[PDB]
mmCIF file of all heavy atoms in Angstrom:
data_model
loop_
_atom_site.group_PDB
_atom_site.id
_atom_site.type_symbol
_atom_site.label_atom_id
_atom_site.label_comp_id
_atom_site.label_asym_id
_atom_site.label_seq_id
_atom_site.Cartn_x
_atom_site.Cartn_y
_atom_site.Cartn_z
ATOM 1 N N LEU A 15 0.823 -1.201 0.000
ATOM 2 C CA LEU A 15 0.000 0.000 0.000
ATOM 3 C C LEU A 15 0.863 1.258 0.000
ATOM 4 O O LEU A 15 0.541 2.237 -0.684
ATOM 5 C CB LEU A 15 -0.929 0.000 1.208
ATOM 6 C CG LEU A 15 -2.024 -1.064 1.187
ATOM 7 C CD1 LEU A 15 -2.648 -1.182 2.561
ATOM 8 C CD2 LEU A 15 -3.068 -0.720 0.132
ATOM 9 N N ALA A 16 1.958 1.254 0.763
ATOM 10 C CA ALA A 16 2.847 2.412 0.801
ATOM 11 C C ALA A 16 3.513 2.632 -0.548
ATOM 12 O O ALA A 16 3.590 3.767 -1.035
ATOM 13 C CB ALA A 16 3.895 2.234 1.902
ATOM 14 N N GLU A 17 4.002 1.561 -1.175
ATOM 15 C CA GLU A 17 4.526 1.702 -2.529
ATOM 16 C C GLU A 17 3.489 2.322 -3.456
ATOM 17 O O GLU A 17 3.840 3.105 -4.346
ATOM 18 C CB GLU A 17 4.976 0.343 -3.066
ATOM 19 C CG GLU A 17 6.235 -0.193 -2.411
ATOM 20 C CD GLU A 17 6.564 -1.608 -2.869
ATOM 21 O OE1 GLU A 17 5.767 -2.172 -3.652
ATOM 22 O OE2 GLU A 17 7.603 -2.154 -2.434
ATOM 23 N N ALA A 18 2.211 2.001 -3.247
ATOM 24 C CA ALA A 18 1.146 2.557 -4.078
ATOM 25 C C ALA A 18 0.886 4.027 -3.764
ATOM 26 O O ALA A 18 0.418 4.767 -4.636
ATOM 27 C CB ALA A 18 -0.140 1.752 -3.888
ATOM 28 N N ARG A 19 1.149 4.458 -2.530
ATOM 29 C CA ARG A 19 1.002 5.858 -2.143
ATOM 30 C C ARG A 19 2.232 6.696 -2.475
ATOM 31 O O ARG A 19 2.231 7.902 -2.200
ATOM 32 C CB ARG A 19 0.721 5.967 -0.642
ATOM 33 C CG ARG A 19 -0.514 5.219 -0.163
ATOM 34 C CD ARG A 19 -1.784 6.031 -0.294
ATOM 35 N NE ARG A 19 -2.646 5.527 -1.360
ATOM 36 C CZ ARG A 19 -3.228 4.330 -1.355
ATOM 37 N NH1 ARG A 19 -3.030 3.482 -0.341
ATOM 38 N NH2 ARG A 19 -3.997 3.972 -2.381
ATOM 39 N N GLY A 20 3.284 6.086 -3.019
ATOM 40 C CA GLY A 20 4.489 6.803 -3.373
ATOM 41 C C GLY A 20 5.349 7.224 -2.199
ATOM 42 O O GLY A 20 6.141 8.163 -2.331
ATOM 43 N N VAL A 21 5.240 6.555 -1.053
ATOM 44 C CA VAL A 21 5.962 7.007 0.135
ATOM 45 C C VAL A 21 7.083 6.036 0.469
ATOM 46 O O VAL A 21 7.030 4.830 0.189
ATOM 47 C CB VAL A 21 5.053 7.211 1.373
ATOM 48 C CG1 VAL A 21 3.957 8.254 1.069
ATOM 49 C CG2 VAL A 21 4.467 5.914 1.845
ATOM 50 N N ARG A 22 8.121 6.592 1.080
ATOM 51 C CA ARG A 22 9.237 5.789 1.540
ATOM 52 C C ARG A 22 8.765 4.812 2.603
ATOM 53 O O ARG A 22 7.959 5.162 3.464
ATOM 54 C CB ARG A 22 10.323 6.681 2.122
ATOM 55 C CG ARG A 22 10.958 7.640 1.134
ATOM 56 C CD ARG A 22 11.870 8.634 1.839
ATOM 57 N NE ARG A 22 12.869 7.964 2.673
ATOM 58 C CZ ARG A 22 13.409 8.466 3.785
ATOM 59 N NH1 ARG A 22 13.108 9.685 4.200
ATOM 60 N NH2 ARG A 22 14.257 7.724 4.485
ATOM 61 N N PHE A 23 9.286 3.589 2.545
ATOM 62 C CA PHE A 23 8.825 2.506 3.402
ATOM 63 C C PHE A 23 10.008 1.629 3.763
ATOM 64 O O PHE A 23 10.759 1.193 2.878
ATOM 65 C CB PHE A 23 7.743 1.683 2.692
ATOM 66 C CG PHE A 23 7.079 0.655 3.564
ATOM 67 C CD1 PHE A 23 5.914 0.960 4.248
ATOM 68 C CD2 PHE A 23 7.618 -0.609 3.707
ATOM 69 C CE1 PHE A 23 5.286 0.024 5.036
ATOM 70 C CE2 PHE A 23 6.994 -1.562 4.523
ATOM 71 C CZ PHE A 23 5.819 -1.229 5.187
ATOM 72 N N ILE A 24 10.160 1.357 5.051
ATOM 73 C CA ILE A 24 11.195 0.483 5.558
ATOM 74 C C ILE A 24 10.491 -0.702 6.191
ATOM 75 O O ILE A 24 9.761 -0.548 7.181
ATOM 76 C CB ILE A 24 12.112 1.189 6.559
ATOM 77 C CG1 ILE A 24 12.926 2.265 5.832
ATOM 78 C CG2 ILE A 24 13.027 0.178 7.227
ATOM 79 C CD1 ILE A 24 13.706 3.169 6.741
ATOM 80 N N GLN A 25 10.684 -1.884 5.617
ATOM 81 C CA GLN A 25 9.940 -3.058 6.067
ATOM 82 C C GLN A 25 10.730 -3.729 7.178
ATOM 83 O O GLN A 25 11.528 -4.644 6.949
ATOM 84 C CB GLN A 25 9.669 -4.021 4.916
ATOM 85 C CG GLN A 25 8.771 -5.172 5.336
ATOM 86 C CD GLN A 25 8.332 -6.036 4.187
ATOM 87 O OE1 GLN A 25 8.759 -5.845 3.038
ATOM 88 N NE2 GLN A 25 7.454 -6.995 4.483
ATOM 89 N N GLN A 26 10.485 -3.286 8.403
ATOM 90 C CA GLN A 26 11.235 -3.757 9.553
ATOM 91 C C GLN A 26 10.361 -3.649 10.798
ATOM 92 O O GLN A 26 9.647 -2.661 10.967
ATOM 93 C CB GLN A 26 12.502 -2.931 9.733
ATOM 94 C CG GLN A 26 13.452 -3.463 10.791
ATOM 95 C CD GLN A 26 14.015 -4.815 10.457
ATOM 96 O OE1 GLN A 26 14.186 -5.657 11.332
ATOM 97 N NE2 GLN A 26 14.298 -5.036 9.196
ATOM 98 N N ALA A 27 10.429 -4.660 11.655
ATOM 99 C CA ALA A 27 9.821 -4.580 12.977
ATOM 100 C C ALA A 27 10.744 -3.818 13.909
ATOM 101 O O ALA A 27 11.935 -4.124 14.002
ATOM 102 C CB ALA A 27 9.546 -5.969 13.540
ATOM 103 N N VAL A 28 10.194 -2.827 14.597
ATOM 104 C CA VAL A 28 10.941 -2.099 15.610
ATOM 105 C C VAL A 28 10.940 -2.928 16.886
ATOM 106 O O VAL A 28 9.884 -3.344 17.365
ATOM 107 C CB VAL A 28 10.322 -0.716 15.844
ATOM 108 C CG1 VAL A 28 11.035 0.015 16.972
ATOM 109 C CG2 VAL A 28 10.326 0.096 14.567
ATOM 110 N N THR A 29 12.119 -3.192 17.430
ATOM 111 C CA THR A 29 12.261 -4.097 18.560
ATOM 112 C C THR A 29 13.132 -3.449 19.619
ATOM 113 O O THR A 29 13.811 -2.456 19.373
ATOM 114 C CB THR A 29 12.894 -5.428 18.143
ATOM 115 O OG1 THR A 29 14.236 -5.163 17.698
ATOM 116 C CG2 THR A 29 12.087 -6.106 17.024
ATOM 117 N N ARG A 30 13.120 -4.028 20.816
ATOM 118 C CA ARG A 30 13.989 -3.511 21.857
ATOM 119 C C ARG A 30 15.445 -3.572 21.417
ATOM 120 O O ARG A 30 16.242 -2.698 21.775
ATOM 121 C CB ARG A 30 13.764 -4.289 23.156
ATOM 122 C CG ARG A 30 14.708 -3.846 24.261
ATOM 123 C CD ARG A 30 14.227 -4.223 25.649
ATOM 124 N NE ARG A 30 15.180 -3.770 26.663
ATOM 125 C CZ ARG A 30 14.905 -3.639 27.957
ATOM 126 N NH1 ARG A 30 13.688 -3.913 28.419
ATOM 127 N NH2 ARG A 30 15.850 -3.220 28.790
ATOM 128 N N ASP A 31 15.794 -4.564 20.598
ATOM 129 C CA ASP A 31 17.178 -4.748 20.175
ATOM 130 C C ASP A 31 17.611 -3.753 19.103
ATOM 131 O O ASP A 31 18.800 -3.425 19.028
ATOM 132 C CB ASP A 31 17.370 -6.176 19.663
ATOM 133 C CG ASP A 31 18.833 -6.558 19.528
ATOM 134 O OD1 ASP A 31 19.488 -6.756 20.576
ATOM 135 O OD2 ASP A 31 19.325 -6.663 18.381
ATOM 136 N N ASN A 32 16.695 -3.255 18.260
ATOM 137 C CA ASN A 32 17.113 -2.412 17.148
ATOM 138 C C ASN A 32 16.601 -0.980 17.188
ATOM 139 O O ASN A 32 16.954 -0.197 16.305
ATOM 140 C CB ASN A 32 16.698 -3.055 15.814
ATOM 141 C CG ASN A 32 15.196 -3.009 15.565
ATOM 142 O OD1 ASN A 32 14.455 -2.237 16.181
ATOM 143 N ND2 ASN A 32 14.748 -3.836 14.640
ATOM 144 N N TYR A 33 15.788 -0.585 18.171
ATOM 145 C CA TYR A 33 15.083 0.678 17.975
ATOM 146 C C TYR A 33 16.025 1.860 18.035
ATOM 147 O O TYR A 33 15.793 2.864 17.362
ATOM 148 C CB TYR A 33 13.936 0.836 18.986
ATOM 149 C CG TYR A 33 14.295 1.204 20.405
ATOM 150 C CD1 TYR A 33 13.981 2.457 20.899
ATOM 151 C CD2 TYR A 33 14.878 0.285 21.273
ATOM 152 C CE1 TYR A 33 14.277 2.802 22.196
ATOM 153 C CE2 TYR A 33 15.178 0.621 22.569
ATOM 154 C CZ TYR A 33 14.880 1.882 23.032
ATOM 155 O OH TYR A 33 15.168 2.239 24.335
ATOM 156 N N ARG A 34 17.098 1.763 18.809
ATOM 157 C CA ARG A 34 18.013 2.889 18.893
ATOM 158 C C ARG A 34 18.797 3.045 17.598
ATOM 159 O O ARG A 34 18.941 4.156 17.080
ATOM 160 C CB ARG A 34 18.961 2.711 20.072
ATOM 161 C CG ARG A 34 18.293 2.802 21.420
ATOM 162 C CD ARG A 34 19.317 2.665 22.538
ATOM 163 N NE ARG A 34 18.729 2.915 23.851
ATOM 164 C CZ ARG A 34 18.584 4.122 24.391
ATOM 165 N NH1 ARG A 34 18.984 5.209 23.738
ATOM 166 N NH2 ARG A 34 18.036 4.241 25.594
ATOM 167 N N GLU A 35 19.311 1.940 17.055
ATOM 168 C CA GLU A 35 20.108 2.047 15.833
ATOM 169 C C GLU A 35 19.248 2.458 14.649
ATOM 170 O O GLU A 35 19.740 3.116 13.723
ATOM 171 C CB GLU A 35 20.844 0.725 15.554
ATOM 172 C CG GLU A 35 19.948 -0.471 15.289
ATOM 173 C CD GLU A 35 20.732 -1.742 14.938
ATOM 174 O OE1 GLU A 35 21.861 -1.635 14.403
ATOM 175 O OE2 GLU A 35 20.212 -2.852 15.191
ATOM 176 N N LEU A 36 17.968 2.082 14.652
ATOM 177 C CA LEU A 36 17.083 2.455 13.555
ATOM 178 C C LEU A 36 16.563 3.880 13.703
ATOM 179 O O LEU A 36 16.620 4.683 12.761
ATOM 180 C CB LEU A 36 15.917 1.472 13.499
ATOM 181 C CG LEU A 36 14.850 1.682 12.435
ATOM 182 C CD1 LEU A 36 15.423 1.745 11.029
ATOM 183 C CD2 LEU A 36 13.855 0.535 12.554
ATOM 184 N N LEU A 37 16.043 4.223 14.876
ATOM 185 C CA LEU A 37 15.258 5.442 14.950
ATOM 186 C C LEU A 37 16.071 6.696 15.213
ATOM 187 O O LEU A 37 15.643 7.780 14.805
ATOM 188 C CB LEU A 37 14.184 5.308 16.026
ATOM 189 C CG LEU A 37 13.121 4.247 15.813
ATOM 190 C CD1 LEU A 37 12.238 4.201 17.054
ATOM 191 C CD2 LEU A 37 12.297 4.534 14.584
ATOM 192 N N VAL A 38 17.221 6.614 15.897
ATOM 193 C CA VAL A 38 18.003 7.825 16.139
ATOM 194 C C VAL A 38 18.451 8.456 14.828
ATOM 195 O O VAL A 38 18.202 9.653 14.633
ATOM 196 C CB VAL A 38 19.177 7.530 17.093
ATOM 197 C CG1 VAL A 38 20.039 8.757 17.223
ATOM 198 C CG2 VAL A 38 18.658 7.124 18.468
ATOM 199 N N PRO A 39 19.057 7.728 13.888
ATOM 200 C CA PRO A 39 19.426 8.391 12.623
ATOM 201 C C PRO A 39 18.223 8.926 11.867
ATOM 202 O O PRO A 39 18.258 10.057 11.363
ATOM 203 C CB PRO A 39 20.160 7.287 11.846
ATOM 204 C CG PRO A 39 20.558 6.290 12.856
ATOM 205 C CD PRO A 39 19.528 6.344 13.946
ATOM 206 N N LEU A 40 17.135 8.158 11.794
ATOM 207 C CA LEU A 40 15.982 8.626 11.040
ATOM 208 C C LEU A 40 15.403 9.900 11.645
ATOM 209 O O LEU A 40 15.027 10.815 10.917
ATOM 210 C CB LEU A 40 14.923 7.533 10.960
ATOM 211 C CG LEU A 40 15.318 6.242 10.239
ATOM 212 C CD1 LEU A 40 14.170 5.261 10.252
ATOM 213 C CD2 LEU A 40 15.779 6.508 8.818
ATOM 214 N N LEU A 41 15.321 9.983 12.975
ATOM 215 C CA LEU A 41 14.676 11.138 13.588
ATOM 216 C C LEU A 41 15.559 12.377 13.641
ATOM 217 O O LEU A 41 15.043 13.481 13.876
ATOM 218 C CB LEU A 41 14.215 10.791 15.006
ATOM 219 C CG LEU A 41 12.989 9.865 15.075
ATOM 220 C CD1 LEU A 41 12.748 9.419 16.498
ATOM 221 C CD2 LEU A 41 11.769 10.581 14.557
ATOM 222 N N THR A 42 16.872 12.222 13.456
ATOM 223 C CA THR A 42 17.813 13.335 13.509
ATOM 224 C C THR A 42 18.389 13.671 12.137
ATOM 225 O O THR A 42 19.424 14.335 12.053
ATOM 226 C CB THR A 42 18.940 13.019 14.501
ATOM 227 O OG1 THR A 42 19.662 11.859 14.077
ATOM 228 C CG2 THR A 42 18.373 12.762 15.892
ATOM 229 N N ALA A 43 17.720 13.262 11.056
ATOM 230 C CA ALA A 43 18.230 13.536 9.713
ATOM 231 C C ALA A 43 18.260 15.028 9.370
ATOM 232 O O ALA A 43 19.003 15.421 8.466
ATOM 233 C CB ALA A 43 17.404 12.764 8.680
ATOM 234 N N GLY A 44 17.488 15.870 10.064
ATOM 235 C CA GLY A 44 17.573 17.303 9.883
ATOM 236 C C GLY A 44 16.592 17.848 8.858
ATOM 237 O O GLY A 44 15.805 17.101 8.274
ATOM 238 N N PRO A 45 16.635 19.167 8.594
ATOM 239 C CA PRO A 45 17.594 20.128 9.166
ATOM 240 C C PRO A 45 17.235 20.517 10.586
ATOM 241 O O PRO A 45 18.069 20.997 11.358
ATOM 242 C CB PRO A 45 17.477 21.339 8.232
ATOM 243 C CG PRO A 45 16.018 21.294 7.754
ATOM 244 C CD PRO A 45 15.691 19.812 7.661
#
């Protein structure tokens, strides 16, 4: 559905083990 809406999509489950490595860069991309 996201591909159909033309939006960026990362197919990943957010977990206790990965949420820091995944979300800190994405949320601080700027400006």
